[PDB]
Amino acid sequence: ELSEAERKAVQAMWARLYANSEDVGVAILVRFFVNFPSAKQYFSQFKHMEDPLEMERSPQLRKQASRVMGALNTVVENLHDPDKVSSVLALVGKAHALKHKVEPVYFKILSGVILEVVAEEFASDFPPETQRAWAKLRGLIYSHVTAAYKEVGW
Template structure:
């Protein structure tokens, strides 16, 4: 059963310490290998998200009713969204030394998902976990414990930034439906 703790609320998390130079390099090096397979990795991430957290599909009118995993994997709309997710992550990873650019990207993503798509902020946390899980499985040769810890720290920071955007927008729960 899917658990949605704190749904509709914005977490108040302490921002993790900034990434060290070593952590930035580990993230960028590992991402380089992932991004070479960006389409397959992105599809794997979204399919895992939708299979493990079916309520996350409610935000996607084009494929929210697709139950079959193979059909999901082949969906042109899912593939297109997977590419957008991977490109956004790529922009963030390439810009780790430029906090203004990273913040700018996350503000655009946060505003769009809060205002236009009305996505509960908890789904960003869920997606972060799914990304880490898929990368650990598909890229085990580069996703060592130390690299995974750096990614976890990055995702915690990104989540704090996105939830801050939601708070600035005065986020209120928009939906009671979770599946």
């Protein structure tokens, strides 16, 4: 869990990010699929795409970006309610294990990608205090998602 200052520093960041949630989610997923093509495999929509400029344009990927961003949104907006953050990531985890059958490690890879993009987008307003704050939310998603994978028996 986080403080009130770390929570506020993360939400202020996410405030800007989510202003153009579509164009940010897309930069994230395109980099995820370019730098880790093994991640595409899980996606019947994208598994046959190699051109990154083709991914930027594709409507289904934009539909997928929104979907991730929006779920992340519910987490960031509820960091004050640890019963809410728990319950949301429980659901994301379980569904990714049971329906999507995704190897839990990719959540770690995706996280790092989210850091790289955020670090480029917001270089001039990403001080040490905010980096650590963001590292704390990363660890939070990861250990809640992995407990769901454990709970379901992976």
